[PDB]
Amino acid sequence: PQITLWKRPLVTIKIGGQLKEALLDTGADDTVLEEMNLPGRWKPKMIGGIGGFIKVRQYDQILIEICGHKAIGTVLVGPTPVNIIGRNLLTQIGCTLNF
Amino acid sequence: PQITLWKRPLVTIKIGGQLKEALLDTGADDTVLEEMNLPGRWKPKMIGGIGGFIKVRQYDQILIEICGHKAIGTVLVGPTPVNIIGRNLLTQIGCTLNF
Numbered sequence A, B: 001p002q003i004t005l006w007k008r009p010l011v012t013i014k015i016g017g018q019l020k021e022a023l024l025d026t027g028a029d030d031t032v033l034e035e036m037n038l039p040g041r042w043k044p045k046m047i048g049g050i051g052g053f054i055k056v057r058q059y060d061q062i063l064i065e066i067c068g069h070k071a072i073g074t075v076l077v078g079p080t081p082v083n084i085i086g087r088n089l090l091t092q093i094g095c096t097l098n099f
Ligand SMILES: Cc1nc(COc2ccc(C[C@H](NC(=O)O[C@H]3CO[C@H]4OCC[C@H]43)[C@H](O)CN(CC(C)C)S(=O)(=O)c3ccc([C@H](C)O)cc3)cc2)cs1
Pocket: A025, A027, A028, A029, A030, A031, A032, A047, A048, A049, A050, A076, A081, A082, A084, A086, B023, B025, B026, B027, B028, B029, B030, B031, B032, B047, B048, B049, B050, B051, B082, B084, B086
């Protein structure tokens, strides 16, 4: 679809069998999701933005469905205030910026 | 134009008569630039990011050119890791997300 930016570009996603709301975020290289106890192996990472860094757990090859568009790749899990879909997955669903 | 997301959506902006590079950031409500001199009055404000809250200088009704497209709006100046163009200005230039 077409998403205007009057409000936060929040959409419904499906990850690890759960539905959540997440931001389609062109300013994020990678995807960061709220704390969730996903199965499988992970590696610790620290990621930074405004206000400093948070610790996250990096899971590879995770399936996420975004408004019906399936994607698979790296997700970082930790205490983010918001679920963030970054460019690693936006590219996979064919998402572009247009003006 | 149509901007794909395989790379960071960096653009040249014009503000205060000076050219800078900035990130088109749909996950940002607000536009936040790195420490720079800007003319006019400003008020102290706080903003929160992934890592916590920072002190910024809020400049209202500032002229800013984004890839030629003119915007006049609020610009926050402070210790952001990256110059980000947020939705307050992306809406002005007619930016949408599409997939
Ligand atoms: C109840 C509460 N809500 C909050 C605020 O919650 C939010 C809401 C949205 C965001 C998204 C964030 N936007 C943002 O900082 O925007 C601020 C300016 O406008 C306001 O509007 C929202 C906040 C304010 C960017 O879009 C994306 N970022 C990078 C850019 C800075 C370069 S990143 O997230 O740092 C990040 C870093 C690394 C990676 C991987 C490793 O690549 C992925 C993402 C973050 C926190 C606090 S408390």
